[PDB]
Amino acid sequence: SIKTPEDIEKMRVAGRLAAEVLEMIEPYVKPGVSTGELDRICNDYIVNEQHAVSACLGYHGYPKSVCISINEVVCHGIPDDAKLLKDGDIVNIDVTVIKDGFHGDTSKMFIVGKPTIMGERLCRITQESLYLALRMVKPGINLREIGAAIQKFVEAEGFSVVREYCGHGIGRGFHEEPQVLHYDSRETNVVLKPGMTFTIEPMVNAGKKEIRTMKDGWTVKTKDRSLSAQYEHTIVVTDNGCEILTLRKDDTIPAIISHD
Ligand SMILES: O=C(Nc1nccs1)C(=O)NC1CCCC1
Numbered sequence: 001s002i003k004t005p006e007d008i009e010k011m012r013v014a015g016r017l018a019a020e021v022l023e024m025i026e027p028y029v030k031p032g033v034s035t036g037e038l039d040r041i042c043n044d045y046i047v048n049e050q051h052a053v054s055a056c057l058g059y060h061g062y063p064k065s066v067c068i069s070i071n072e073v074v075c076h077g078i079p080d081d082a083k084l085l086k087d088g089d090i091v092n093i094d095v096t097v098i099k100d101g102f103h104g105d106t107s108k109m110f111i112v113g114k115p116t117i118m119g120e121r122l123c124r125i126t127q128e129s130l131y132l133a134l135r136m137v138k139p140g141i142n143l144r145e146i147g148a149a150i151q152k153f154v155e156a157e158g159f160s161v162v163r164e165y166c167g168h169g170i171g172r173g174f175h176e177e178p179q180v181l182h183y184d185s186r187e188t189n190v191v192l193k194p195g196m197t198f199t200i201e202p203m204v205n206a207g208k209k210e211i212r213t214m215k216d217g218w219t220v221k222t223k224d225r226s227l228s229a230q231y232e233h234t235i236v237v238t239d240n241g242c243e244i245l246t247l248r249k250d251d252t253i254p255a256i257i258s259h260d
């Protein structure tokens with residue numbers, strides 16, 4: 001749908017909160033911490049300090065506040081008090097906060113302790129795949145073009161794009177239309193218009209594209225057990241570009257992108 005300025009104002013708030021959860025949690029992502037504790041830290045911050053709520057907690061049956069996906073876990077990794085992070089791990093923490101009725105959805109990769117060459121590369125390339133997509137967002141561009149660009153970039157770096165999961169519209173709803181595929185598909189025919197709000201969250205595997213759902217029904221792993229990485233931002237299409245609503249202090253892309 002198309003958001004009104006009033007709606008967007010609220011999404012800036014929700015987006016900022018979600019981004020601040022990732023900024024706040026970064027220092028905590030080190031060797032020895034459990035994903036369960038990280039989840040608790042995020043939730044306590046969201047509820048007690050931001051006076052907001054995790055959109056993930058309870059969503060479609062999800063049992064935790066954030067999704068934490070380590071190494072080969074592609075997405076929806078369930079925080080676990082017994083799962084400890086260690087040197088070299090690449091970890092995605094996907095956050096979604098609701099505030100004043102609107103959602104802010106974002107994720108980033110954290111590398112624990114000493115990064116491995118491939119781990120740093122996969123994360124960097126993945127973030128750049130998101131950045132290149134964000135730099136294309138403007139009225140008139142077709143979402144299919146963005147998916148094509150992401151895939152082309154990722155595969156040229158020897159990595160694969162997960163097909164199953166995609167970006168999504170967002171607002172009062174967590175996952176609204178349209179679907180934002182991260183690969184070229186004729187199924188995609190959406191011309192961007194001002195006011196549209198959605199996410200871009202490419203999941204990239206170091207190995208093959210195939211994935212598999214684990215026994216908990218949420219955790220997804222690469223079929224070949226290769227490393228996987230993902231970054232995500234929620235944006236609003238502006239009259240001549242876009243505004244990243246979940247920009248962080250560490251992001252290396254501007255919040256307001258304009259074309260012409
Ligand atoms: O439900 C999804 N993600 C969640 N993260 C935390 C709680 S729920 C999700 O990505 N769903 C998509 C796959 C099916 C429909 C869209």
Ligand SMILES: [Co+2]
Pocket residue numbers: 076
């Ligand atoms: Co999800």
Ligand SMILES: [Co+2]
Pocket residue numbers: 094095096105106107201232
């Ligand atoms: Co997300």
Ligand SMILES: [Co+2]
Pocket residue numbers: 105106167168199201232
């Ligand atoms: Co999302």
